[PDB]
Structure 1
Amino acid sequence: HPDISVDVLVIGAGPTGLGAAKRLNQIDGPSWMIVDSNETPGGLASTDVTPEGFLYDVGGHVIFSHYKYFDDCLDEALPKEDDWYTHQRISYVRCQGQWVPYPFQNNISMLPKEEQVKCIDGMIDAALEARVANTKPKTFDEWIVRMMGTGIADLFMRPYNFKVWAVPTTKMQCAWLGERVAAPNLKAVTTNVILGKTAGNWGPNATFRFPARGGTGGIWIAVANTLPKEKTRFGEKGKVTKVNANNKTVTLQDGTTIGYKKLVSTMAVDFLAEAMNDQELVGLTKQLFYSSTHVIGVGVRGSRPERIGDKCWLYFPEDNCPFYRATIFSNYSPYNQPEASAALPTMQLADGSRPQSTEAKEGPYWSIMLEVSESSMKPVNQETILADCIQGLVNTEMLKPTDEIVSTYHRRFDHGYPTPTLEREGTLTQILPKLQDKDIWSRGRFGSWRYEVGNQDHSFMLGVEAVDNIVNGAVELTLNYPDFVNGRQNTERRLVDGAQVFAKS
């Protein structure tokens, strides 16, 4: 007999676990509890703060929701209008000294005419091939070329994607991209070239909302706060060290044992295999591939520069900087950095020099958040990456050499991106059903390892749907059919369903 027994045990209190917990709490049938090794819930959707008062998410986090249920829970958690700021989804690609509006191909009018020719010629070849194609592309790289042609591929998507995924495009599958035909809109691209037109894919009806305070992490603290505390176990007291799948028992770091009938596990599935002492599963999970993420944060003195303006996130295919993406984090909330009246000494200039003066000066302040990927195919020198990033900011004209840096941040996250390699699906089909047969629902960004359903809303719903499968025999649509859930508005499932309305009568 174990110290604790519940119907459904949830491991992990990032978005996926909290999703499971919210649905269990709403259903209010089977007993349950949720554990996490961290005292603060949120996982990779948490937020750090520097000693100088600059917040950083785990890299650029922008919410786009495909589900009403996720909306209900965020609304419940942060119900006030001033809990949120709304922004247009404004992004550019840095290329040859220019900020090119995303998506890159509709905007090549900004490049020299000789580059436009190369790009259009390439897209003409792709259009003519697509006209007679009768096989689907097999790799990300094939998909990219067929869609963009060679010239456009080489300027952006090819080099950018290696900088993000930390594996060559030729090593990745292309199903995760969805089911749209791999072929150019030659006319649209050419029409904008001819008219000398630029056009971003944002506007009044393409926005996101971002929490007013606490960064992205503020959301998950607040969602977790709506749960009954006695059913949570967050911190050292909730760290899982052993999972005995045959006994349906979990052991915590402090020796506590928890018996379950069903397990929803949201920790990285390779960690789960180890915790299970299951050598066959360990072997299989070791076949999966992932990249690590270095988040670098830079706090800067001054009112926001005109060159920066209302930019949100930015892409960097070029090799004059180590990061693949920069976020103007100070544009997301004025509470992501200190007030103007806060006094801070200059730590260094962007050119790397350090002033002798220790004088604390006032703001205002703005803030840049950078991401650098790492894998066994792309090493990162942790000791110089901060200074390399800062030099990169100078090379891309984001910072002037004389800009005053008042805060810095660097953190490496081991499991950053689950990689859609060619082998991923073959391996997952040997892993997930095996766990399933042991009444283990492994789900989440690393729980089930599928980037195309790896955002905050997807993750949350992987937990919600897992519980719905366990209790109500629901289909796990997000897990098995990402194109299905991503291609529609999912409005049917709500924080208050008919079951609760009828029961309250």
Structure 2
Amino acid sequence: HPDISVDVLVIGAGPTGLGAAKRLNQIDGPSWMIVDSNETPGGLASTDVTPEGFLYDVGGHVIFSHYKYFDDCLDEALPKEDDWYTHQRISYVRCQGQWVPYPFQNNISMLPKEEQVKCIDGMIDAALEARVANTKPKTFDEWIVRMMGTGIADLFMRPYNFKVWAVPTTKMQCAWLGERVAAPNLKAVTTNVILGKTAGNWGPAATFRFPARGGTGGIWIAVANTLPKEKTRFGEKGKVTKVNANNKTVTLQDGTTIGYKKLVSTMAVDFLAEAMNDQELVGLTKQLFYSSTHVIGVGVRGSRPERIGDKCWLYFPEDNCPFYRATIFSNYSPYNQPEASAALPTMQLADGSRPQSTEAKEGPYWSIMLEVSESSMKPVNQETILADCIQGLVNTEMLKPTDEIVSTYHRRFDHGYPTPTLEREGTLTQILPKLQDKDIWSRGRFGSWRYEVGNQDHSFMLGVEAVDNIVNGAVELTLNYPDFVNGRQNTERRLVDGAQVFAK
């Protein structure tokens, strides 16, 4: 008989696992337990800090919540108004020397006139074709061009998406974008071109909140802390090494065995198939595709340059830089980098030069966070990528050659994006029902591998809904119907439900 027995075991304490745990904790029915190999919960929603005191998330993390329940747990965890900062959702596309407001097509007035002509002509073709279309697009590429036309597609979404996904747009499905018809808003686009108008999709209503301290990672430490500590096992002692699906037994690295009746696994599903020693599942998970993410962080001396201003995140379709996205992380919280009086030496100038002096000087400081994707179709030279990113910062006029870099950061995350390939659904609908037959609920960004429900709130709710299905017979809506949950505000499920009110 096992060392420990619980009704429901949760593997992994990123957002998905912590969602499952919060719901089990609230229900307070079946016994339960959560394990993670890391001492610190959060998964890919964690945060690092450099020796010089610059924080970096695992790339740009901006919360948009589709669920009251998710909101309830964040409010519980970080309940003070000064636990958070609010910002507008300000983003731009870098294109031919210009910062073009997102969405790109509504702002092509900034481009040269001859190019505007090409863009409008292409979108006219797409509008005329959309008017008689009687089939759905089958690939991401087809969807892009039917929405945007050839010209606008070639400038942004085609080269941008290869830089992000590390696979061509022709090899991805397009159902994950939702059920919106692939057609141009020709009038809107042409109107701004005629008016010479620019317009971003943000304002006092289009906002996000970001944690005052600890980066995105601070949220999940705070949420985890609301759980009964004896029901958690985090660290080397919590690393899962073996899953015996037939005996419903799990073995940890230190040899501890855990028996379960139901399993919620939030580890990557290809790792799960190995831990199970299931040759059939290993073969199937190997049919899936993912990209790795390099996160590069750069700490810069000086007050925030006028050219940067209130920018939050930025897209880079062009090939003069390796990164697809940059984040002005110092704009998210004053505590993402040291205060102005902190003294740091200059490590190098942006052009690669040595500084005049080695003396530690004061701030203030700002901070840029970069993302570079990697796959077997898009290799990344690990040894030069930092320097390539810094050159890319100069090329894109984010840094001057003279800017003083005081901190650098580079980390590679093996599983970064689960790719919406054409083959994905054919594979997942074999994998997930086989796990289900064994009472294994494999869920999460890489637990169930669906990018369109792959953010923090989706993940958290995948765990919540998994538990609700296990206990109360709930439909796993986020898992099976992304369009459904993304197109509504999910208000019904709360951190305090009728059941707990009636109980007291």
What's the offset of the Cα at 1:358?
A: 1.3
Query: After TM superposition, what 4+ stretches of structure 1 lie above 4 angstroms from structure 2?
Result: none
For residues 425-476 of structure 1, the C-alpha deviation after alignment (integer angstroms, 9 at most, x for no partner) is 0000010000000000000000000000000000000000000000000000
Matches for 1:286-297 after TM superposition, within 5 Å = 286-297=286-297
**Residue-by-residue CA offset, 1:397-450 (whole Å, 9 max, x unaligned):** 000000000000000000000000000000000100000000000000000000
Give distance in 2, aligned partners of 1:478 and 1:212.
29
String of CA shifts for 1:328-368, please: whole Å, max 9, x gaps.
Answer: 00000000000000000000000011125210000000000
List aligned pairs for 1:147-162, cutoff 5 A. Answer: 147-162=147-162
Matches of 1:482 and 1:93, distance apart in 2: 27
**Aligned partners of 1:118 and 1:305: how far apart in 2?**
34
1:146, CA displacement in angstroms? 0.3
**How far apart in 2 are the matches of 1:215 and 1:21?**
22
Partner residue of 1:460? 460
CA distance in 2, matches of 1:72, 1:349: 45
Separation in 1, partners of 2:166, 2:236: 33
Describe the superposition over 1:129-178 as per-residue Cα deviations: whole angstroms up to 9, x where unpaired: 10111000000000000000000000000000000000000000000000
For residues 344 and 107 of structure 1, what CA distance do their matches in structure 2 show? 40
State the alpha-carbon separation in 1 of the partners of residues 91 and 358 from structure 2: 36
Task: Write the distance in 2 (CA, Å) between the matches of 1:140 and 1:193.
Answer: 26
Partner of 1:318: 318
1:92 and 1:357 map into 2 onto residues whose CA distance is 35
Compute the RMSD of aligned alpha carbons: 0.4
- Secondary structure in 1 aligned to 2:176? coil
SS at match of 1:263: strand
Q: Distance in 2 between matches of 1:444 and 1:356?
A: 49
Structure 1 Cα separation of the partners of residues 212 and 355 of structure 2:
34
| Structure 1, gaps ≥5 residues long | none
Distance 1:286 1:354 in 2: 46
Q: Distance in 2 between matches of 1:329 and 1:76?
A: 25
Q: What SS does the corresponding residue of 1:360 show, helix, strand or coil?
A: coil
How far apart in 1 are the matches of 2:118 and 2:55? 42
Whole-Å Cα distance in 2 between the matches of residues 309 and 453 of structure 1? 31
Q: How far apart, CA to CA, are the structure 2 residues paired with 1:358 and 1:487? A: 54
- Alignment length, in residue pairs? 504
SS in 1 for 2:10: strand
Report the 3-state secondary structure (helix = DSSP H, G, I; strand = E; otherwise coil) of the residue aligned with 2:320. Answer: coil
Residues 8-60 of structure 1 deviation map (CA, whole Å, 9 limit, x = unaligned) = 00000000000000000000000000000000000000000000000000000
Q: Secondary structure at the match of 1:164?
A: helix
Q: Distance in 2 between matches of 1:143 and 1:358?
A: 53
What does the per-residue CA deviation read over 1:60-100, in whole Å, with 9 as the maximum and x for residues that have no partner? Answer: 00000000000000000000000000000000000000000
Offset from partner CA, 1:232-263 (integer Å, 9 cap, x none): 00000000000000000000000000000000
In structure 2, distance between residues paired with 1:376 and 1:223: 36
How big is each residue's C-alpha offset from its partner over 1:354-389, in whole Å with a ceiling of 9 and x where there is no partner?
A: 125210000000000000000010000000000000
Distance in 2 (alpha carbons) for counterparts of 1:283 and 1:356:
57
Quote the Cα distance in structure 2 between the aligned partners of 1:457 and 1:421: 23
The whole-number CA distance in structure 1 between the counterparts of 2:261 and 2:285 is 24
Structure 2 residue matching 1:187: 3-state secondary structure: helix
Q: Secondary structure at the match of 2:408?
A: strand
Aligned-partner Cα distance in 2 for 1:170–1:301: 42
3-state DSSP class of the match of 1:270?
Answer: helix
Q: Tell me, what secondary structure is at the counterpart of 1:19? A: helix
Query: Is the deviation greater in 194-203 or in 349-358?
Result: 349-358
Q: Distance in 1 between matches of 2:150 and 2:226?
A: 51
- The DSSP-based 3-state class of the residue aligned with 1:216 is helix
CA distance in 1, matches of 2:284, 2:444: 18
Alpha-carbon distance in structure 2 between the residues aligned to 1:127 and 1:333: 43
Once residues 272 and 356 of structure 2 are traced to their aligned partners in structure 1, the CA distance between those partners, rounded to angstroms, is: 51
SS in structure 1 at match of 2:215: coil
CA distance in 1, matches of 2:296, 2:117: 37
- Which whole-Å CA distance do the structure 2 matches of 1:359 and 1:409 have between them? 21
- Counterparts of 1:160 and 1:178, CA distance in 2: 20
Give the equivalent residue in structure 2 for 1:309: 309
Separation (CA, whole Å) in 2 of partners of 1:198 and 1:477: 38
